[PDB]
Every structure is written in C-alpha cells, then in structure tokens.
Amino acid sequence: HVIFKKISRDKSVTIYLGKRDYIDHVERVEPVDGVVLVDPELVKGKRVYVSLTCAFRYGQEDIDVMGLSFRRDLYFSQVQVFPPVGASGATTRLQESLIKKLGANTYPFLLTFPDYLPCSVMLQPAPQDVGKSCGVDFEIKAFATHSTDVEEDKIPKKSSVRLLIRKVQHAPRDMGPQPRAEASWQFFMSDKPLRLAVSLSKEIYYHGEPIPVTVAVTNSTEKTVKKIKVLVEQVTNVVLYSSDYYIKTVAAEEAQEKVPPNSSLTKTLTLVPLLANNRERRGIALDGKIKHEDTNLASSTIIKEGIDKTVMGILVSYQIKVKLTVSGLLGELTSSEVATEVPFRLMHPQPE
C-alpha cells in the first residue's frame, strides 16, 4: 500500500489515498479512507467536498468517433470536508499519520461502499462484436465550490482533483458445492450411449490457480471419440442500455488420447485462464484498461440475494466446456461434436 496524492491545478485542493484497489470480499467492502489538504487562503469562503461515484458507461470512448454515450450512476456519496461539519467519526491510522505529517489544513474523509455494486469491469468489442465499449468505473473527486452574487454553484476545474480507483473481488469465507456434470447421447440409428461425466476439484478458483478438470468418457457406441478438448469460457452479458452477449475461450487443452468404440477413459486435464494466454484482449471482460500491467480477466460477478441483476451493469461468468469429437460411421459425411459445460467462479484469494 503506497500513499499517493493528486494536487489541483490551482494548488488549493490535494487529495491523498493509501491505495488504488479496495477489496470486496462479499462479507464486506473496504471503505475509502483518505485526507484532503487545503490551501486555507485559496479556500477561504468556499466549501470543499469529496465524492465517491460508481458509474456504468456505454459507448465508443474515442473522443473523435461520433456515437451515443450513456451513463448510470450506480452509487454516489459525498461529504463536506471544509469547513469542518463536526461529524467525521474516528480516524484510521492512515488518516492520523497524514494529518500529523501535513498539519492543521488536513481533513479526513471516509466514503463507504454499499453491498449492491459490481466490481471493476470493462470491455472493448472485437471486430466481429456488434456492441460498443462499456464498463464500470469508480472515481474519488475532491473539489472546491462557491457562489458569487452573479453566479451560483461554481465548480472551477482548477480547484478539483479526481483519482480513479478499483473495487476488486476477493473470495468469501465459503464456496459452493463441488462442480459436477453428467450427460449422455444416443446418436441417430443406434441406442448405444456415449456418456460424459465431468468434475472440478472445487467451485471457486483464484486468478493464476490451475483448474483440474476430471473427465470420464464411457463410450458404448460404434464411433471413436477422436478428440477430447477442454476450454475455459468467459461469458459476459451487458444488462444495462444494450443487451450484448460475449463468449470467449480464455484457456484450452486437448487430451493426447482417443476413446475407441466400446471403451472408457478417465483423464484429468489442467487449465489456467489468464489474460496472458491470448494476444487478443478485445471482446473480453477485464478489470482495467487493456494497456495496464495490473489488468487481469474480470472476476466472476457475485450478485447479492434479492438484487435486480440489471443494477450490476455487466455480468461476468466462467465455465469449463468439454467438447468430444465423434467419428462418422460409414455413409456419414462428417464427424460430429457434443459438449457439456460446468460453471465455476474465478476471483482473487480470500483476504489475509
């Protein structure tokens, strides 16, 4: 946790934070504790506020590309820090240490997050996608405002600062039951079954953690299972403004083995879904800008019970897909494919 600051152009307002990323671990969300350092001469007669905004945005970003824009503020909170209102509550150690360092013109703020928000997520469409760029952004802003006898609500940019922050998904205390699937198929002209059972070791994996997929194929058919392929697919549903759908392979492995007619195979394949696995980063839900080094695949959405899921803006989910390629018998023109899917969740580790 490295302390950073930003100073307004006129030097009247400086905001300090202790970190950029705020952990959501379901049970609670870390609040944004910081301070504002004012220049008392330059804020005389003015009020200084600090706000936290969570916004869903939709629309081409490029400021030289004509196109609609949409924004919904999913959350907003604001406090007056100057003049002091006298209702600030207890300081954190961070705030205490900054107030000591910076002196009497330093004022604390604490802006909490509610329980009904998504985490940081954004997407940029690939060429064959029809939807537009969209995301969920979090901003802290400090600014001075005043009125003159000729103009009300003045908010000069030079007396304002903003810092972009993230809300990042870490694992809760518990997780769901072991992921399992079972499917069977009977093909045209034969009642002989092909059976596929799939299990994952557990229901939550962490970013970077290998995912062991255990596949059991029971092939009573006359056909050969020529290929066993296992994918991690990311599924993204945009649920405000435009109903956009994305599904993208973010890891893949193929077994060496085939399954001949009238035979069985159990195999475990291990996959690791990582943004680093593909050069193409468009059409994928990320937790940050394509460029940045701190950018990862977006964590699974975790919706609060009873919430209208549309308020999340963008829903991100993950699944394992197991695809079996099945040989054609004499007379058939092509091989065939069958598949089944197994959901799991992907996020950062439990908090320490």
**Rounded to 5°, angle at Cα 103 from 98 and 109:** 50
How near is the Cβ of 250 to Na ion at its closest, in Å?
A: 22
How near is the Cβ of 304 to Na ion at its closest, in Å?
A: 5
Three-state SS string over 183-220 comes to EEEECCCCCCEEEEEEEECCCEEECCCCEEEEEEEEEC
Nearer to Na ion, 269 or 316 (CB): 316
- By CB neighbour count within 10 A (0-12 exposed, 13-18 middle, 19+ buried), where does 115 fall? exposed
Q: Return the residue nearest Na ion (CB atom).
A: 302
Nearer to Na ion, 198 or 239 (CB): 239
Nearer to Na ion, 115 or 182 (CB): 115
How near is the Cβ of 89 to Na ion at its closest, in Å?
A: 25
How near is the Cβ of 313 to Na ion at its closest, in Å?
A: 13
Nearer to Na ion, 252 or 302 (CB): 302
Is the preceding omega at residue 83 within 30 degrees of 0, hence cis? Answer: yes
How near is the Cβ of 26 to Na ion at its closest, in Å?
A: 6
Burial 140-177, CB ≥16 within 10 A → b, else e:
bbbbbbbeeeeeeeeeeeebbbbbebbbbbbbbeeeee
The binding site for Na ion (CB under 5 A) comprises 302
CA distance 47 to 310: 36
Nearer to Na ion, 99 or 302 (CB): 302
